[PDB]
């Protein structure tokens, strides 16, 4: 029951998402083995997701978390990359498909940095890469990330479910020497995929 709203490149909504996409790119210390080598993206499409039923599922849970956290939902816009993006925009987020082998338990992981979620679009650690060329650093095939609303509530700083009294877990693991933040929820209701971003990484040369 979802419909997608095509945003024009000359739109403030489009540009803020585009900006947050480009500005949050980091220089991963794994030589781009996971997500590929790039500085910026070639942003092809940014579609806003509309689903009243899933939005009501979210705002309902958001209110519940606010009450449990001194009326502070701790709402944040975060990126999510996975091969199941197109399933999520219709069925919503679902903890029953959570990353079981995750560092912070079976949950739904997000990131501050767009480039960090990019490492998970084709699978954990990039998987085998794109379906056609089997290249984790493919500059041809289009990729898709979600730019979601995320109710963190009272987040627990660590280093399955949420620890007691909390609603999410915030980490900052140092992969290959660089520390970047992570965010995990253990209930799909605490996230709404607001924007679907179709893009591709640019060959830096």
Task: Choose the one of Zn ion, ligand Q28, none that binds residue 141, judging by a C-beta under 5 to 8 angstroms depending on kind.
Answer: Zn ion
Q: Say which DSSP state 164 is in.
A: T
DSSP class of 8 = P
Rounded CA separation 163/107 (Å)? 12
Q: How far is the CB of 183 from ligand Q28 (least distance, A)?
A: 8
Among 38, 58, 93, 199, binds ligand Q28 (CB under 6 A): 93
> Does 84 contact ligand Q28 by CB under 6 A?
yes
CA distance 149 to 171: 18
Which tokens hold the place of 33? Answer: 């083995």
The sign one gets for the Cα dihedral 88, 91, 92, 96 is negative
**Number of residues lying near ligand Q28 (CB under 6 A):** 22
- The phi and psi torsions of 141 (rounded to 5 degrees) equal -65, 140
Ligand-binding annotation for 50, yes or no, is no
* 97 sits near ligand Q28 (criterion: CB under 6 A): yes
Spatial distance between the Cα atoms of 51 and 92, rounded to a whole number of angstroms:
9
CB 109 to ligand Q28: min, Å: 3
Minimum gap (Å) between residue 37 Cβ and ligand Q28: 19
Number of other residues whose CB lies within 10 A of the CB of residue 37: 17
Decide if residue 182 touches ligand Q28 (CB under 6 A): yes
Contacts with ligand Q28, residue ranges (CB under 6 A) = 80-82, 84, 87-88, 91, 93-94, 97-99, 102, 108-111, 116-117, 120, 182, 188
Binding-site members for Zn(2+) are: 130, 133, 138, 141
């Amino acid at each position: 029951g979802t419909i997608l709203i095509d945003l024009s490149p000359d739109d403030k909504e489009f540009q803020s998402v585009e900006e947050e996409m480009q500005s949050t790119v980091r220089e991963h210390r794994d030589g781009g083995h996971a997500g590929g080598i790039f500085n910026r993206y070639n942003i092809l499409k940014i579609q806003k997701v509309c689903n009243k039923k899933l939005w009501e599922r979210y705002t309902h849970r958001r209110k519940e978390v606010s009450e449990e956290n001194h009326n502070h939902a701790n709402e944040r816009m975060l990126f999510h990359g996975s091969p199941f993006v197109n399933a999520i925009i219709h069925k919503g987020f679902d903890e029953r498909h959570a990353y079981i082998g995750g560092m912070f338990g079976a949950g739904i992981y997000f990131a501050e940095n767009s480039s960090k979620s990019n490492q998970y679009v084709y699978g954990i650690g990039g998987g085998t890469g794109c379906p056609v060329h089997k290249d984790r650093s493919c500059y041809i095939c289009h990729r898709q990330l979600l730019f979601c609303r995320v109710t963190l509530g009272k987040s627990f700083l660590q280093f399955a479910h949420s620890p007691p009294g909390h609603h999410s877990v915030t980490g900052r693991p140092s992969v290959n020497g660089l520390a970047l933040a992570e965010y995990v929820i253990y209930r799909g209701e605490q996230a709404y995929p607001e924007y679907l971003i179709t893009y591709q990484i640019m060959r830096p040369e």
